[PDB]
From a paper:
Neurofibromin 2 belongs to the FERM (band 4.1, ezrin, radixin, moesin) gene family characterized by an N-terminal FERM domain that binds to the plasma membrane, a central α-helical domain, and a C-terminal tail domain that binds to the cortical actin cytoskeleton. The neurofibromin 2 head–tail interaction is critical for controlling the tumor-suppressive function of neurofibromin 215,16, which seems also to be regulated by phosphorylation.
In both polypeptide chains, the PIP2 inositol head group is sandwiched between Trp-60 and Arg-309, the 5′ inositol phosphate interacts with the backbone of Arg-310 and the 1-phosphate group is in hydrogen-bonding distance to Arg-309. The oxygen atoms of the diacylglycerol interact with the hydroxyl group of Thr-59. In the apo structure, a short loop (residues 312–315) allows αH to interact with the F1 FERM subdomain (specifically by electrostatic interactions of Arg-57 with Asp-314). Importantly, in our lipid-bound structure, the F3 subdomain is in the conformer seen in the apo structure in the space that is occupied by the tail domain in the head/tail structure.
Numbering used by the authors: 15 to 339
Write the structure that this text describes.
């Protein structure tokens, strides 16, 4: 009764470090998630999740379900990856905390370096120069001599392989730019990185292999702004886009999704996805990106009505004071 343990070890991998916790057997995804966020000193929690792997696909820990009721490998230690599941529409405006900025920066940078997000050559060099400023601080020629970035992974392999320039030549190109960032703090460098990275075409898009009613292979993109249909030969530019405020509803029925445009003149867009595991993620990401999009609109409109009011209050206050003279 009191001899069976009340907890089990869970390993949590962030972009920074790994750490272990005592997860209570009864705990839900929310309990474990909140413990991780508290430990990290992270309050902008809504962008994040705890990911594991079901078969070959990614699975996020569901908040309302028991940790142990998930299909996660139970070999000691049960491991989860603390990652961003949602991206802001404007990183500079939305990522208030340094920890949030840092975690987004490392994850997005890994996506860039792993070629999960296409990045052109010049952009890649500029991005590397900010990653160097963030890690090394201000450029110092007496300390940062030739070969100082020799052991660093700074550009996508795709970019390195297009030119056949030597590592020291890439380092020179990166150092030339790095010299221009003198004075910028770590958080400032990481934010300049994100401002460039957030304008990349594949940034923040969750792609899924889908088929239309005619059996034509396409890619679905679920992002902060809406649902997007890509031709599989082009992941950069979608051919059709349905912004979250221009969708009446999304319905799912027997491996078939139906996007119902708000404009009744546009016909419904039906598509098929085979794996039920994937269909659960698509729905999750639609419901949750839609909700965050709506909340940004509510925050935007509230922020306007607060300025309007404060301007009227302050203008009227200052007028009242002028009439007392």
């Amino acid at each position: 009764k009191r001899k069976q343990p009340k907890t089990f070890t869970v390993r949590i991998v962030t972009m920074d470090a790994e750490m272990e916790f005592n997860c209570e057997m009864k705990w839900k995804g929310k309990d474990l998630f909140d413990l991780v966020c508290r430990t990290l000193g992270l309050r902008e929690t809504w962008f994040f999740g705890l990911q594991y792997t079901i078969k070959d696909t990614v699975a996020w820990l569901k908040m309302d379900k028991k940790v142990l009721d998930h299909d996660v490998s139970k070999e000691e230690p049960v491991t989860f990856h603390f990652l961003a599941k949602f991206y802001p529409e404007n990183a500079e405006e939305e990522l208030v905390q340094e920890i949030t900025q840092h975690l987004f920066f490392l994850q997005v940078k890994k996506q860039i370096l792993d070629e999960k997000i296409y990045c052109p050559p010049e952009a890649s060099v500029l991005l590397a120069s900010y990653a160097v400023q963030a890690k090394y601080g201000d450029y110092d020629p007496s300390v940062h001599k030739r070969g100082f970035l020799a052991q660093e992974e700074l550009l996508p392999k795709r970019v390195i392989n297009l030119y056949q320039m030597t590592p020291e030549m890439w380092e020179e190109r990166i150092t030339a730019w790095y010299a221009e960032h003198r004075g910028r703090a770590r958080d400032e460098a990481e934010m300049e990185y994100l401002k460039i990275a957030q304008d990349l075409e594949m940034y923040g898009v969750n792609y899924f292999a889908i088929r239309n009613k005619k059996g034509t292979e396409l890619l679905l993109g679920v992002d902060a702004l809406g649902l997007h249909i890509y031709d599989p030969e082009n992941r950069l530019t979608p051919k059709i886009s349905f912004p979250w405020n221009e969708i009446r509803n999304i319905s799912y029925s027997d491996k078939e999704f139906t996007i119902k445009p708000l404009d009744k003149k546009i016909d419904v867009f039906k598509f098929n996805s085979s794996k039920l595991r994937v269909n659960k993620l698509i729905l999750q990401l639609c419901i949750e990106n839609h909700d965050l999009f709506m909340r940004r609109r509510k925050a935007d409109s509230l922020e306007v009505q607060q300025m309007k009011a404060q301007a009227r209050e302050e203008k009227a206050r200052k007028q009242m004071e002028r009439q007392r003279l």
